[PDB]
From Swiss-Prot, chain A:
Family, similarity comment: Belongs to the nudE family.
Annotated tissue distribution: Expressed in brain, liver, lung and testis (at protein level). Expressed in brain, epididymis, eye, heart, kidney, large intestine, liver, ovary, pancreas, prostate, skeletal muscle, smooth muscle, spleen, submaxillary gland, testis, thymus and thyroid. Within the brain expression is pronounced in the cortex, hippocampus, olfactory bulb, striatum, thalamic and hypothalamic structures and in the molecular layer of the cerebellum. Largely excluded from cortical progenitor cells which express NDE1.
Residues with the Phosphoserine modification: S5
Lipidated positions per record (S-palmitoyl cysteine): C36
Effect on the protein of changing E30A: Impairs interaction with DISC1
Protein name as it appears in the record: Nuclear distribution protein nudE-like 1
UniProt PTM: Phosphorylated by CDK1 and MAPK1. Phosphorylated in mitosis. Phosphorylated by CDK5. Phosphorylation by CDK5 promotes interaction with KATNA1 and YWHAE. Palmitoylation at Cys-36 reduces affinity for dynein.
Segments of this protein annotated with the region Interaction with DISC1: 4-42
SUBUNIT field: Interacts with PLEKHM1 (via N- and C-terminus). Interacts with dynactin, PCM1 and PCNT. Interacts (via C-terminus) with CENPF. Self-associates. Interacts with DISC1, dynein, tubulin gamma, KATNA1, KATNB1, microtubules, PAFAHB1 and YWHAE. Interacts directly with NEFL and indirectly with NEFH. Interacts with ZNF365. Interacts with GTP-bound RAB9A; the interaction may lead to RAB9A-dynein motor tethering.
Function noted in UniProt: Required for organization of the cellular microtubule array and microtubule anchoring at the centrosome. May regulate microtubule organization at least in part by targeting the microtubule severing protein KATNA1 to the centrosome. Also positively regulates the activity of the minus-end directed microtubule motor protein dynein. May enhance dynein-mediated microtubule sliding by targeting dynein to the microtubule plus ends.
Compartments in which it is found: Cytoplasm, Cytoskeleton; Cytoplasm, Cytoskeleton, Microtubule organizing center, Centrosome; Chromosome, Centromere, Kinetochore; Cytoplasm, Cytoskeleton, Spindle
Portion held of the full protein: 238 to 279 of 345
Region described as Required for localization to the centrosome and interaction with dynein, dynactin, tubulin gamma, PCM1 and PCNT: 19-42
Species whose genome carries this gene: Mus musculus
Swiss-Prot record, chain B:
Domain notes: The tandem configuration of the two ZU5 and the UPA domains forms a structural supramodule termed ZZU. ZU5-1 mediates interaction with beta-spectrin, and the ZU5-1/UPA interface is required for ankyrin's function other than binding to spectrin.
UniProt name for this protein: Ankyrin-2
Tissues expressing the protein: Present in plasma membrane of neurons as well as glial cells throughout the brain. Expressed in fetal brain and in temporal cortex of adult brain. Also expressed in the inner segments of rod photoreceptors in retina.
Stretches of the chain forming a coiled coil according to its record: none
Subunit structure of this chain's protein: Interacts with RHBG and SPTBN1. Colocalizes with Na/K ATPase, Na/Ca exchanger and SPTBN1. Directly interacts with DMD; this interaction is necessary for DMD localization at the sarcolemma. Interacts with DCTN4; this interaction is required for DCTN4 retention at costameres. Identified in complexes that contain VIM, EZR, AHNAK, BFSP1, BFSP2, ANK2, PLEC, PRX and spectrin. Interacts (via death domain) with RABGAP1L (via Rab-GAP TBC domain).
Record PTM: Phosphorylated at multiple sites by different protein kinases and each phosphorylation event regulates the protein's structure and function.
Gene: ANK2
Subcellular location: Cytoplasm, Cytoskeleton; Membrane; Cytoplasm, Myofibril, Sarcomere, M line; Apical cell membrane
Lineage of the organism: Eukaryota, Metazoa, Chordata, Craniata, Vertebrata
Length: 42, 69, 39
């Protein structure tokens, strides 16, 4: 309750690893749903 | 499709892991079930629109973690 | 932690706040994907 400390480098690298997984998944979901919307408009 | 749902389930687990890394929350009182249910009811728009917002937010988090600011 | 500095407290809390918003949105996304129907 004294404040927030810096994130360790290893924890920062772990969070970066996970955000990579999230960005690959969201990119694929974006492409899938964009294709659904664009196939329908066409 | 079930494959879309399984990818989103994996993203939800990724976000729980990121929460555990980043939090200083010392039964995880900072996570409120009633707030999660309300948000699942009230988030506006179709899946494509929500995905675009999720992607923008993830790109922002990535920039904070990679660049440090 | 090779080649990597600690994440400042301010960046840590900024990231945590966005991750919280993302968890709420991804719950909504899981709901709408399961419920969406083609008419």
């Amino acid at each position: 309750g004294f404040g927030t400390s810096p994130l360790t480098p290893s924890a920062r690298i772990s969070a970066l690893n996970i955000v990579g997984d999230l960005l690959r998944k969201v990119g694929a979901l974006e492409s899938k749903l964009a294709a659904c919307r664009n196939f329908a408009k066409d | 499709s079930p494959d879309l749902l399984s990818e989103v389930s994996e993203m939800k687990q990724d976000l729980i892991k990121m929460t555990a890394i980043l939090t200083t929350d010392v039964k995880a009182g900072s996570i409120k079930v009633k707030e999660l249910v309300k948000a699942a009811e009230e988030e506006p728009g179709e899946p494509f629109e929500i995905v675009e917002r999720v992607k923008e937010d993830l790109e922002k988090v990535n920039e904070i973690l990679r660049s440090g600011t």
